Every structure is written in structure tokens, then in C-alpha cells.
């Protein structure tokens, strides 16, 4: 229940995330836009910062989400270590120019950087993310605001992200008042309707992983793909909903939002300026195996985050593995890196010798994690790229057994027994086969926006704000079709929010 103890913990967990977001957005402008840090160097510095901040205030407390920096195709999972930088090169050495940013660590111009992170205190957690964008510099200008706005489909994506974010914020604010809503009381039906029509206006589809949901203590949705739950009220937009919208558990009907509750928003929009046609938007995993295929568009990598399934137990033969398991289970149920578990990781002072100390510890931790993973104690949080499939291949396909195809050597089970589209009787395995079975291997760029809110009378928005996620000014088109019900409602909502009360937590200096 929303006690003072609960909500001030939420606040002090949130604004740490806010100031760390400011730190990263600081550093990236320092590095690229200003007169050069790589992705994995940003990540552990951000986590060091967050823990150094956490120490001052406050027993279970730490990083829910390790800071993830997706670039231009990846829906989620990219957050590598310093161990893996040469490995990424000598794996992707023969591939082509795409994914050069994520491979090398140096970011390019026009590169759509989706940052995300989160922090938790006693199970009360706050996630946040922001799609920012790189654009080259002005040199003749004195102040050098960097030159050019964005124009294309990525601009579409950013616009849809921000607009969907503000609209759902306002909707969940009107959840307090059964009034101050255009009748054009609140339901996942309405939420999915307004966000889908925004996506359709901007020609940017919703990604399967996106959601809006309730939160409770220790139960946020940090994983959302591995661990299960019976009591989960919230909305998702996956391939089943895509096919249903083309036609015409997570129940959406018996769901009306109430006072005194904490919610997570997480929206992912994949742009369509090419593609030519109607088609599906699904996800494909990234493995470390160069040898499964010959094509150059594929990315080869190793995920850094893990999560451990405390239900299972197995004595290890290996001292290093058992010590690392001690270090793990003394942490919590949230995902983690190997760098988080170490002796010198927060970097009270920072030099090269401490990074070297961390690297040696990492060399031991990978050996421990080998045995901890060969037994099914810990699993990887997968790296997922958005990939497009036209309906032509799917409808012309041949699936000799539908609703019965497992994938049988997928290790997690829950991404195995999925059945994304029950109609047409195709499963994830045959969908992967069809996605690969075509020279229309079109991968989409994606934009991401994540916030945490709580309903008391005001909407207390524990993340976001204008300091945080002010958008990179851009130049998009398809800017919001008027002459419909829902668009009138959305504009009335945006005007009426200026009076509804939205409190917003500021970052820490």
C-alpha cells in the first residue's frame, strides 16, 4: 500500500535514475557533440555512479536494470562488458558495415541511442529510458548547437514515442478523476486504442516487448520474458494483437485502473518508411555463434546480463563458481552483470589499475559462470533485434504441424511455448524459419521510452520530466491525422493536462 515509507523510497530510487540519466547524457555530449567514450565504458561508469549515490541514503537495495544502450536495431539487451570488446571485433570482423556502432563502441551520426536503466530499494523500483539521437556539429556557429534536424523514419519513431508517452501519462492521470476525460472509465481497450492509432498515424508499429502494467514490491516486470506470474494486470502489443487488428494470459477487459497504485510505461516503436507492404514486426535473438550462417547482416555477440531462478539448486564442483553464486544470491532477484559483483567496482577513485583489477576478476567470473550456466541456475537475458516479415511468405508458408511445434532445445521454455499468432497455427520456431527463409531480411530501427508513475489528488511521475527526456528537435512528417474521435480526445487531453496535476520528481545535483 502507498505509505509514506513506500512513496519516499520510490522517490529516492527514481531521482537517482534521473541524475544518472543526466550523467550519461552529459558524458555523451562531452564525448561526441563537444570538441571519446565507448558504450561499455559508459555503462559501468553509470552503474558505479548509481551505487555511489545509493550508498549515501540507506537492506535489499541496488540496480534493477543494468544500464542498456541499444543502437538503431536492438529492441533490448545490449549492455556489454569490457571483456568483450576485442571478441566483438574478431567475431564480426568479416561482417558488413551495419551494427558498426554496437560492434566498435564508437557511436556514429544519425545513430538512434536508446538508453534505459532502473534502481530499486527494498523491492520498490523505478525504471526509465530515453531515445536520444546523434546529429553532427556546427563549426562556424559560436555556440555550436549541432547541425541538422532528423528526417526519415527514425524521426517518426521518436515522435510516436514522445507523444504516446505524454498521452498515456495524461490518461493515467485522469484515472484519478471520473471526469476531465473526453468521452471520445479507463481500460486497456482505450489505452491500446489510442496508442495503436498514434502508431498508425506515424507509420511506426508497436514492438512485441512493449507494455504498460502494474507494479508491486519486488514484482515490476524487469524480466517479463523469463519468469512467470498469475496476477499480472496490464497491456501488451504482440503478434497476436497484430493479427487480430488485421482481422477486425494478460486479459484486457477486466482491467480498470484505480487510485493508490504504481505503474510502468514502456513503449517501443519500429519505423516503416520502406518495407513497401503490410508485414509483421517480431524479434530475433543474437547468439555468439559465427558458424550457424554465412550472411553478413547478422550480429554476433554475448549478452552480459543474467538472472537466477532461485527455485533451483545444484552443488557446483568449482570453488570459483560457488563463491560467485554466494555473491549472486547475496544480491537480489533483479538482473546483474559480472562487473557489479566485485571488489573495486564502484570506483571510489578511478584509474587504469582498478579497471585492470576488475578485468582479472572478470576472467575468473566467466569461468564460474560457465559451470553456473551449464547447470540451469542462471540464464541470459537475450539480445533481441526487431525484424520485419511480409505476410506473403507467412501465408504461402507450409507448417505440417501447427500448435504442436515446440522448439525443444530452447533453454527457457517460456519463449518456447509461446504460440505468438494462434490463428494460422504458426509458432515462433517456424516464424524464425520464415524470417530467415527470405531475401527480404529487413530489420527495422526502433525508438524506446520508459517511465514510472504512481497514482495517489495528482499523478506523481517518478521519472521523465523535461530535464530528463527533452526530445532532440527533429523534422518528421505524418504528424497526427486530425478528423477523428480519438485524435480530438488526445488533443483535449493534452490541453487539459495543463491545468490535471502532474507532479514530477527532479534529479539530484
Amino acid at each position: 500500500i502507498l505509505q509514506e515509507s513506500v512513496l519516499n523510497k520510490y522517490r529516492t530510487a527514481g531521482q537517482i535514475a534521473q541524475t544518472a540519466l543526466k550523467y550519461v547524457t552529459s558524458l555523451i555530449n562531452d564525448s561526441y557533440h563537444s570538441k571519446q567514450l565507448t558504450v561499455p565504458e559508459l555503462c559501468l561508469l553509470t552503474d558505479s555512479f548509481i551505487l555511489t549515490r545509493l550508498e549515501q541514503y540507506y537492506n535489499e537495495r541496488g540496480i534493477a536494470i543494468p544500464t542498456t544502450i541499444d543502437i538503431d536495431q536492438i529492441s533490448g539487451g545490449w549492455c556489454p562488458e569490457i571483456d568483450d570488446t576485442q571478441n566483438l571485433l574478431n567475431w564480426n570482423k568479416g561482417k558488413d558495415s551495419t551494427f558498426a556502432s554496437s560492434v566498435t563502441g564508437t557511436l556514429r551520426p544519425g545513430d538512434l541511442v536508446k538508453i534505459t536503466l532502473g534502481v530499486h530499494i527494498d523491492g520498490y523500483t523505478s525504471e526509465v529510458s530515453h531515445t536520444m539521437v546523434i546529429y553532427p556539429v556546427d563549426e562556424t556557429k559560436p555556440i555550436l548547437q549541432p547541425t541538422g534536424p532528423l528526417l526519415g523514419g527514425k524521426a517518426d519513431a521518436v515522435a510516436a514515442a514522445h507523444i504516446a508517452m505524454e498521452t498515456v501519462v495524461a490518461l493515467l492521470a485522469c484515472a484519478l478523476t471520473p471526469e476531465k476525460l473526453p468521452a471520445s472509465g479507463i481500460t486497456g481497450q482505450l489505452i491500446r486504442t489510442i496508442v495503436d492509432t498514434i502508431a498508425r498515424s506515424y507509420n511506426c508499429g508497436v514492438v512485441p516487448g512493449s507494455r504498460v502494467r502494474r507494479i508491486r514490491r519486488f514484482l515490476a516486470g524487469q524480466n517479463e520474458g523469463i519468469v512467470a506470474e498469475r496476477e499480472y494486470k496490464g497491456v501488451v502489443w504482440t503478434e497476436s494483437h497484430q493479427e487480430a487488428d488485421l482481422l477486425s494470459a494478460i486479459p484486457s477487459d477486466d482491467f480498470v485502473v484505480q487510485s493508490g497504485e504504481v505503474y510502468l510505461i514502456d513503449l517501443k516503436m519500429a519505423s516503416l518508411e520502406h518495407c513497401t507492404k503490410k508485414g509483421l514486426v517480431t524479434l530475433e535473438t543474437v547468439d555468439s555463434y559465427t558458424g550457424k550462417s554465412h550472411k553478413a547482416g547478422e550480429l554476433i555477440a554475448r549478452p552480459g546480463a543474467y538472472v537466477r531462478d532461485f527455485a533451483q539448486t545444484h552443488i557446483l564442483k568449482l570453488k570459483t563458481s560457488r563463491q560467485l553464486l554466494t555473491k549472486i544470491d547475496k544480491q537480489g532477484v533483479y538482473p546483474f552483470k559480472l562487473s557489479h559483483l566485485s571488489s573495486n567496482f564502484p570506483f571510489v577513485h578511478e584509474n587504469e589499475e582498478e579497471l585492470q583489477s576488475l578485468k582479472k576478476d572478470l576472467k575468473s567470473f566467466r569461468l564460474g559462470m560457465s559451470e553456473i550456466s551449464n547447470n540451469y541456475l542462471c540464464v541470459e537475458s537475450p539480445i533481441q533485434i526487431a525484424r520485419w516479415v511480409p505476410w506473403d511468405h507467412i501465408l504461402k508458408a507450409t507448417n505440417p504441424n501447427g500448435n504442436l511445434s515446440y522448439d525443444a532445445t530452447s533453454t527457457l521454455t517460456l519463449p518456447g511455448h509461446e504460440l505468438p499468432l494462434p490463428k494460422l497455427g504458426v509458432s515462433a520456431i517456424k516464424l524464425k524459419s520464415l524470417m530467415n527463409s527470405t531475401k527480404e531480411s529487413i530489420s527495422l530501427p526502433v525508438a524506446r521510452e520508459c517511465n514510472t508513475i504512481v497514482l495517489c489528488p495528482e499523478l506523481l511521475r517518478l521519472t521523465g520530466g523535461s530535464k530528463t527526456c527533452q526530445p532532440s528537435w527533429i523534422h518528421s512528417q505524418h504528424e497526427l491525422n486530425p478528423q477523428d474521435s480519438i485524435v480530438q480526445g488526445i488533443f483535449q487531453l493534452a490541453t487539459l493536462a495543463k491545468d490535471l496535476l502532474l507532479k514530477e520528481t527532479q534529479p539530484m545535483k
Binding site: 488485421l246 482481422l247 503490410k278 505476410w391 506473403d392 501465408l395 490463428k423 494460422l424
Partner: peptide, 16 residues
């Protein structure tokens, strides 16, 4: 023959 009908309707929607 439900797959027949749903594929017919889906062809109808994607062709236009």
C-alpha cells in the same frame, strides 16, 4: 476449413 476462411479474409485485407 477455418484456416481456409481466415486466410481468405487475410488475403482480402492485405491485397487492399
Amino acid at each position: 476449413s477455418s484456416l481456409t476462411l481466415v486466410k481468405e479474409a487475410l488475403w482480402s485485407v492485405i491485397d487492399d
